[PDB]
């Protein structure tokens, strides 16, 4: 039964992994164990009654894996068949990178926190479409695999002055083959990216993605899993004041984009004691209360038109919860992944299930944005 995510082997490697052994060696170990597809998996049927939707993406659970867990996509159908329904690769940009200095990553299994500062490290536009590319074969071939959705993270080389330029490049090279392009504008890790957060340059790099993405019709064209155009996200940082945040929606109101990802990173957090000192943003169990807020936030100012990806210290069905009354339509892991090991997808799936069933809804759907 090594097959089974849940198999008692996998916590007890973990908590080791988590102890002792460096965390992008045990991320290394990770990528090695899906490329050779020998994960764990669960294919089993997930409840019809938390399926979820952003306009024509039909997600068979409310559970993806977040950008920069694999930047790559060298590893794509073993992450999903862990029991998610989607995975962001990426952040990719046109040339590859190999970020920021070493040691950049660090882990507080006290706290259930990461800090990074990763730095868009990744091989390419060029080199992840291909990857890419394989998998959209692979899934051609694998009924399991064929309602899985895959969307694509965009930013900019880190030397590039005009991030649009890189946004255009990658759309013409990646996005007939991803169901969604996340623009992210809000690393704290690429100096001057969170600037593109201002409404005015959002605007018009929004604008510039989306004539871009309907130019590819002018010029079986969709080798994805909608068959369609990739929807349009932004991802957006939570430290912004609230003119930002007011300004941001009226943008995303006026451009129509299909959702917004809350949200990447935080600065702002001051008390883990083993972080003190270092750059870089904060995932995990410390993120939830800002970035869930973040969320009552924006499905206000955007008056509940523009579908929410929920980010940040997601580890529990009850954590999903919150999300999805806050006004989330599906949720996204990373933190969880890393310290909960390959149950994770497995796991939260029971928990947001049994919650569903105790709190009286009849699916998934009827809990978004209840808080409101
Ligand atoms: C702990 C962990 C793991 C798991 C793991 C690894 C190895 C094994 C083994 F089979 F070997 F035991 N089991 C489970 C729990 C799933 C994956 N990733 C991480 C991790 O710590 N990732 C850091 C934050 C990271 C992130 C980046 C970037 N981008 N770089 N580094
Ligand atoms: C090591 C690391 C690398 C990340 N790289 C990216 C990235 O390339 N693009 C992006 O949009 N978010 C990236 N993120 C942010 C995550 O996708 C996610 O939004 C964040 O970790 C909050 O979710 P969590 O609290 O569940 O971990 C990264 C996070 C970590 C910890
Ligand atoms: O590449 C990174 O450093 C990075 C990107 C991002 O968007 N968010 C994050 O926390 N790190």
Redesign the pocket.
């Known amino acids: 039964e090594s097959y089974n995510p849940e198999f008692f082997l ?1 916590d007890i ?2 908590k080791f ?2 102890k002792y052994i460096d ?2 060696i ?2 290394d ?2 990528l090695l ?1 899906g490329k050779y597809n020998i994960l764990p998996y669960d294919t089993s049927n997930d409840s019809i009654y938390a399926c979820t939707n952003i306009k024509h993406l039909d997600f068979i659970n409310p559970f993806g894996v977040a950008a ?2 694999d ?1 790559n996509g060298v590893c794509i159908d073993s992450i999903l068949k862990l029991g998610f329904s989607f995975i962001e690769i990426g952040t990719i940009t046109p040339r590859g990178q190999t970020g920021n200095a070493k040691p950049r ?1 660090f ?1 507080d299994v006290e706290s259930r926190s ?1 800090i990074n500062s ?1 730095g868009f490290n990744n091989m390419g536009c060029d080199k992840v479409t291909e990857n890419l590319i394989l998998f959209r074969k692979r899934q051609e071939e694998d009924k399991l695999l064929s309602k899985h959705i895959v969307g694509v993270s965009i930013g900019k080389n880190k030397d590039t002055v005009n991030i649009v330029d890189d946004l255009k490049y990658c759309i013409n090279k990646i996005g007939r083959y991803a169901d969604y392009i996340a623009i992210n504008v809000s690393s704290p890790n690429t100096p001057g990216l969170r600037d593109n957060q201002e409404a005015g340059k959002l605007k018009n790099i929004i604008l510039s993605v989306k004539e871009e993405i309907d130019n590819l019709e002018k010029n079986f064209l969709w080798f994805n899993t909608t068959k369609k155009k990739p929807l349009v996200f932004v991802k957006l940082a939570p430290d912004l004041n609230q003119e930002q945040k007011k300004e941001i929606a009226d943008v995303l109101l006026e451009t129509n984009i299909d959702g917004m990802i809350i949200s990447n990173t935080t600065t702002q957090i001051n008390d883990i004691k083993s972080f003190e000192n270092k750059k870089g943003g904060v995932s995990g169990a410390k993120l939830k209360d800002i970035s869930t807020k973040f969320i009552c936030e924006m499905y206000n100012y955007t008056n509940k038109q523009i579908p929410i990806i929920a980010s940040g210290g997601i580890f529990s069905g009850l954590d999903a919860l919150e999300k999805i009354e806050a006004g989330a339509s599906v949720c996204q892991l990373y933190s969880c ?2 310290f909960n ?2 149950k994770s997808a497995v796991q939260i799936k029971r928990e947001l299930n049994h919650l569903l069933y105790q709190r009286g809804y009849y699916n998934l759907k009827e809990a978004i944005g209840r808080k409101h």
Request: glycine share 14%; hydrophobic share 50%; with cysteine.
């Open positions: 996998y490697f973990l992994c988590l965390g992008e045990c991320h170990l990770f164990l920069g867990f930047k990553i882990r990461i990763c992944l890393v090991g390959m």
